[PDB]
Write a protein that binds this ligand. Structure first.
Ligand code: HEM
Ligand code: HEM
Lengths: 420, 101, 49, 444, 55, 54, 220
């Protein structure tokens, strides 16, 4: 065995991806265009709460049977979500697909959000949100999207405090009825035969066609949000509007990313192939970390660098990260650096799909924001087809555009966006 | 049929909780199911049951009842909890049955 | 740091069979318990009398 | 479509070919463009002595700071530039250095590996830097209760022996270890018969073993050289160690009995058993409906923040137990319920429970071969531990033979009336008396 | 109510908080044995005493 | 604690069963026999002793 | 004071100069009422440019003088009144610090109307910066200010505060007639100029409530 990747596209617009790799395990998923992006000052957090609500009673199965039933076959069930996409997947051995599927279908299409079940659940948002925020990494990112925007994307990923307990069965229902619509959903599925995954999506997936609520355009603000909290370590993130998903300029940035440096490849090692790192290294003497930050969203994106450092040295460290961006925007890029990166990127991409998880994610992502599957050789052809200029230009666009900065720690010696 | 559909109306008046202004569901002995059921009642139905009950208790200590005008009428009695209580028991029976399996 | 922490030596108290650090204590376990439990059991018999 | 039974058979086999210098080369060839290859060594802190404790760790820190054929800058740059990922680790009984790259570089990778294990630079100037760094990581790791706890669990469960030492070693050892000692350690332990070249992804076994012959040369003369040393056995002791600090937010407790060791078939049943008890943690959404009784209770009575079962194996021994994290005032009830579940395992397991426990365990073993690195980790280990590879097809045959009656017999044999080893850290005043805990080891 | 019935039960709870889970100094000597003896002694008197009073 | 009726190890017991103890507002006369039974008991014991001394 | 006080001499730690940032901080908290404050570098204490603002303050309007009453003598208020229909409040904000100050307006309003309300308060500032100030408005304010000042000292508290403030940041006591002479000695221009300095300078804004319909500093 070893072949294909079919992908039907039902009447109502419901896309169905599929691929049989004969893995002793399946992993079906329901991808959807939904998230804190469609939230309005009136229903904030309803996205977050909807995420934790997956195990609540559904018209077909009960809170009890869902969890018991899935565990009965050594199954699993999770909900991963960005500011603009929500994925509901379940894993299990090949012979239990049909069983685990019931709850999957039920959860995503037929929730009941019973008032009480919902009231008892909300206090959880306080907890769930508390473990996440244990990593400062997650704090500045929230506040970034808040300074980088005025709406949609500016909406936080974790239910804001004041709204805990104030969400309602209505809000959840409406949110679901207005977004979990066949033309915004995709039913991907590794480890299964296409006809089977298709038949399922048909006779069952009820909540039909529509495009419902449409997200407001992503306006750009370019604000600066600072958080003085005492931490000995200051986290900083300075960015500019970059490329958006499916943008021609995207592949350019992704490359300028690896060029500047984004993530180590050697344990406890130094990164020479990382200009940004190497630059900051020469700047400070004490421990730190700096990387190329790059996010690609449907109608917008963010690009820049992120730096962790001792409070008293965030000044010299952030500057350094800047100069190394200006220096790169002024042709400070070898034709080889462009070659190296391109490799690191193709490798990174190719490794990122060995995981049952990483694969399904990749496949589904396309099948939703496209309806097709760009062959691995095509994505490779698109990547190296990036001039040494596209890169320097990307860099420019950054040194020119209006920057938005997010920083948190003992900011006493940290610079303001206008001092860079 | 509409035979005991009379007997019921008879017994309903025979009992006489309605002389206290209590709904049939107000007089239920609060065991475990009934207790869970009551937690699901909406804020408003809950406070209403509460006043009705506290009202009845005050009448009992006083050794009085409500004037005939205020008595709940057989056909106007709200089975406000029966719906919830019925589900609570099904859920339970589901679990009970599933744990033997 | 916790890496600098080590359990003191209980030689002065260990029973004869679990005195050697390179010998499985499991082999002599049934013995060590059967004895203590034998004492206890006896106490019961004596008390039951 | 195809069944679990079949997908399990059509899994490409694992090739293993020994060289002449004793080294074993193995791999599982997939259709993947990317791959992972590395060397799993049978070395660790257990092999250390009282004076070189932490050398194997001090080595892991230099392993990547360049070799002789190519110094620091060169080495790193050469690896980075090819988009390859270099990583590795070192436990009590097993070290490993592996790389993730394109199936294309498979041979160039192998050369790098061989260059690291065989030619570590050990630059006198580098050593004075990793010494300061290691001392840092110690202070950091000191603040990770879960590990301070498991270290303490060993520090006593195997008190007075080799398995009693931490992998990072002592402060003194690190402050004084020498270029000589590091050198020695490497020359003493990193040797072909005790090593295994594991590879997974898109690679020709034959191309692998070829590139192997060419880079792993060192051919032994005497018999001593290609003889794998048997380690002196470690004695288990029922006992406790209580590191109290009421100033810590929550408390950690870990309790365990002595395990059978890699080779014993029982380890399968033991894992099936831990499957029944499972694990919990405040974020599990399943909540009060989880199938794990302890988890349900944990939920119902707000017993803990989390808990995990484990069956840590070693060559000749092991640790079977659990570890939970709770608030000062719920420590006793948690411990009570937990030990309770162990007693249930020995006395009243249900086919329903094992049936489910087995499905969980299967999905588990499968999930351990989800990627090239995780399949390589398996190969490197299996050979090193079982002296061969064990296919999921096999695991499954064994796992399916396990039943209630069986689980009960095994658990009783390893848990019932045993004197456990207890490690407690934090505001532990409410958890008390070894005696009371010991008594929780019998009568359901 | 509570996990183990030794803490929840209105009676056992009393037996527990005074003869089982009750906190005692780790260093009390033999001089602290007379309390229980006094108690035991008392039960014995009453028991033998009744047997004698019946004759 | 402010008032000695709640703090004291003994009064506290007397208080939580005969003074600050929560009772339904509507219990009738049929709930009077408990105390009577009790009082009745103290009376028997008292008269009984007086008789046993002769 | 003498034969008793002892921690002494010198001026020890000196405050770092007051740099100006001009940031915009927003706080989304659900409140049905949105509070907003937009300002610009104002005047320092003991400065001549002070009185000018204080006056532009009363001119734009700062605080009602009639219980439950409307403020006609308040341009800012009156302006915003014409703008929205629902309840609100708007005033002239003015702070004078040793080496700097802050000036602008502060507005309270229903969330859905903070947009139209804040704009209004702005237009009424631009309009005033473009000579939209009668020579009489300057006269009225000057009175409201001298009155306010004079009343603010009937209190044992208010008096000591007044006296002490000077004796510390000066070492003397400006007679009440002198402070009066300083106040009315403010041209109709100083006022319009003050207003200008605001419409020109870099603004910094602070707002908290259901900001869903509240504007950003760069949309004014
Ligand atoms: C605090 C517990 C008690 C003490 C210290 C105690 C002490 C004594 C003493 C000092 C005697 C004299 C024995 C002799 O030398 O002949 C005695 C006799 C007696 N006691 Fe007790 N006694 C106790 C409890 C009881 C009780 C509870 C009963 C039965 C209700 C009882 C029934 C008798 C009888 C029947 C005698 C007379 C028989 C005899 O002389 O041995 N005693 N007791
Ligand atoms: C539950 C409490 C008690 C009950 C139900 C009770 C009942 C009685 C009864 C049925 C009689 C027969 C009286 C007759 O008709 O002649 C009696 C006799 C007697 N009782 Fe009690 N009694 C009680 C407690 C006591 C106690 C505590 C004592 C003293 C320790 C006691 C001492 C006597 C004596 C001395 C007699 C014989 C004198 C007589 O016949 O009146 N009794 N009692």
């Amino acid at each position: 065995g070893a072949e294909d990747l079919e992908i039907t596209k039902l009447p109502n617009g419901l896309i169905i991806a599929s691929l049989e790799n004969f893995s002793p395990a399946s992993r079906i998923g329901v991808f959807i265009k939904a998230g804190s992006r469609y939230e309005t000052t009136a229903n904030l957090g309803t996205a977050h709460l909807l995420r934790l609500a997956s195990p609540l009673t559904t018209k077909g199965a009960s809170s009890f049977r869902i969890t018991r039933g899935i565990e009965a076959v050594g199954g699993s069930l999770s909900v991963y979500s960005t500011r603009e996409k929500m994925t509901y997947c379940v894993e299990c051995l090949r012979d239990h697909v049909d069983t685990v599927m019931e709850y999957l279908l039920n959860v995503t299409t037929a929730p009941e959000f019973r008032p009480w079940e919902v009231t008892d659940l909300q206090p959880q948002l306080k907890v769930d949100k508390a473990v996440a925020f244990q990593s400062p990494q997650v704090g500045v990112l929230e506040n970034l999207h808040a300074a980088a925007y005025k709406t949609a994307l500016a909406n936080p990923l974790y239910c804001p405090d004041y709204r805990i307990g104030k969400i309602t069965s209505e809000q959840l229902h409406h949110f679901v009825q207005n977004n979990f619509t066949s033309a915004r959903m995709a039913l991907v599925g590794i480890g299964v035969k296409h006809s089977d995954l298709k038949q399922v999506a048909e006779q069952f997936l009820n909540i039909r066609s529509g495009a419902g609520t449409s997200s407001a355009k992503a306006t750009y603000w370019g604000g600066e949000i600072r958080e003085q909290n005492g931490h000995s370590l200051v986290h900083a993130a300075v960015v500019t509007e970059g490329a958006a998903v499916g943008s021609a300029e995207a592949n350019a940035f992704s490359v300028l990313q690896h060029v500047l440096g984004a993530g180590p490849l050697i344990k406890r090692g130094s990164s020479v192939t990382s200009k940004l790192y190497q630059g900051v290294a020469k700047a400070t003497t004490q421990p730190f970390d700096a990387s190329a930050f790059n996010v690609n969203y449907s109608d917008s994106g963010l690009f820049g660098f992120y730096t962790i450092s001792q409070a008293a040295h965030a000044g010299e460290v952030i500057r350094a990260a800047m100069n190394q961006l200006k220096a790169a925007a002024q042709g400070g890029v070898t034709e080889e650096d462009v070659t190296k990166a391109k490799n690191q990127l193709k490798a990174t991409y190719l490794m990122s799909v060995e995981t049952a998880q990483g694969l399904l994610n990749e496949i589904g992502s396309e099948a939703l924001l496209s309806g097709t599957h760009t062959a691995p050789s095509v994505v490779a052809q698109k990547i190296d087809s990036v001039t040494s200029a596209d890169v320097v230009n990307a860099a420019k666009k950054f040194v020119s555009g209006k920057k938005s900065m997010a920083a948190s720690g003992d900011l006493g010696s940290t610079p303001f966006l206008d001092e860079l | 049929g509409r035979l005991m559909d009379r007997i019921r109306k008879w017994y309903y008046n025979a009992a006489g909780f309605n002389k206290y202004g209590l709904m049939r569901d107000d007089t239920l002995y609060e065991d475990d199911d009934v207790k869970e059921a009551l937690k699901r009642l909406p804020e408003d139905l809950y406070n209403e049951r509460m006043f009705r009950i506290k009202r009845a208790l005050d009448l009992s200590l006083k050794h009085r009842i409500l004037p005939k005008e205020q008595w709940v009428k057989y056909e106007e009695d709200k089975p406000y909890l029966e719906p919830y209580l019925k589900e609570v028991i099904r859920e339970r029976l589901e679990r009970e049955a599933w744990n033997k399996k | 740091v916790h890496n600098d922490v080590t359990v003191p030596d209980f030689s002065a108290y260990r029973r004869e069979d679990v005195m050697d650090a390179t010998t499985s204590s499991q082999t002599s376990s049934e013995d060590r318990k059967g004895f203590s439990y034998l004492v206890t059991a006896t106490a019961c018999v004596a008390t039951a009398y | 479509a195809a069944t679990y039974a079949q997908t399990l058979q059509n899994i490409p086999e694992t090739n293993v070919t020994t060289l002449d210098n004793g080294l074993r080369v193995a791999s599982e060839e997939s259709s993947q463009p990317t791959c992972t290859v590395g060397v799993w060594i049978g070395a660790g802190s257990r092999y250390e002595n009282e004076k070189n404790n932490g050398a194997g760790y001090f080595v892991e820190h230099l392993a990547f700071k360049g070799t002789k054929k190519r110094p620091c800058a060169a080495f790193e740059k050469e690896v980075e530039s090819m988009g390859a990922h270099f990583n590795g680790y070192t436990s009590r009984e097993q070290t490993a250095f592996y790389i993730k790259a394109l199936s294309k570089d498979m041979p160039k990778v192998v050369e790098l590996l061989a260059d690291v294990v065989q030619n570590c630079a050990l630059e006198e100037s580098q050593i004075e830097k990793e010494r300061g760094v290691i001392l840092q990581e110690l202070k950091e790791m000191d603040n990770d209760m879960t590990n301070v706890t498991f270290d303490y669990l060993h520090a006593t469960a195997f008190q007075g022996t080799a398995l009693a030492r931490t992998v990072e070693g002592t402060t003194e050892n690190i402050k004084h270890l020498t270029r000589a000692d590091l050198a020695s350690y490497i020359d003493t332990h990193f040797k072909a018969p005790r090593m295994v070249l594991a590879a997974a992804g898109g690679i020709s076994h034959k191309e692998l073993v070829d590139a192997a012959r060419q880079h792993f040369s060192g051919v032994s003369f005497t018999y001593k050289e290609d003889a794998v040393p048997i380690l002196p056995r470690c004695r288990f002791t029922g006992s406790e160690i209580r590191a109290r600090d009421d100033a810590l937010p929550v408390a950690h407790v870990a309790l365990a009995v002595e395990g059978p060791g890699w080779a014993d078939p029982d380890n399968v049943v033991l894992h099936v058993a831990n499957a029944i008890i499972g694990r919990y943690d405040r974020t599990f959404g399943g909540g009060k409906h989880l199938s794990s009784r302890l988890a349900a209770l944990a939920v119902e009575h707000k017993l803990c923040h989390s808990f995990q079962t484990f069956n840590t194996s070693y060559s000749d021994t092991g640790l079977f137990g659990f570890h939970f994290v709770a608030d000062p005032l719920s420590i006793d009830d948690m411990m009570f319920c937990a030990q309770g579940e162990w007693m249930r395992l020995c006395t009243s397991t249900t086919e329903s429970e094992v049936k489910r426990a087995k499905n969980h365990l299967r999905s588990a073993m499968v999930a351990q071969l989800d990627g090239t690195t995780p399949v390589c980790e398996t190969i490197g280990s299996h050979l090193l531990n079982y002296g061969r590879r064990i296919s999921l097809e096999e695991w499954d045959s064994r796992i399916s033979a396990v039943d209630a009656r069986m689980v009960r017999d095994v658990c009783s044999k390893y848990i019932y009336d045993k004197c456990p080893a207890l490690a407690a850290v934090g505001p532990i005043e409410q958890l008390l008396d070894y005696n009371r805990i010991r008594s929780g080891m019998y009568w359901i | 109510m509570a996990p183990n019935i030794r803490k929840s039960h209105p009676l056992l709870k009393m037996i527990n908080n005074s003869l089982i889970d009750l906190p005692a100094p780790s260093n009390i000597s033999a001089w602290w044995n007379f309390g229980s003896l006094l108690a035991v002694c008392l039960m014995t008197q009453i028991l033998t005493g009744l047997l004698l009073a019946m004759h």
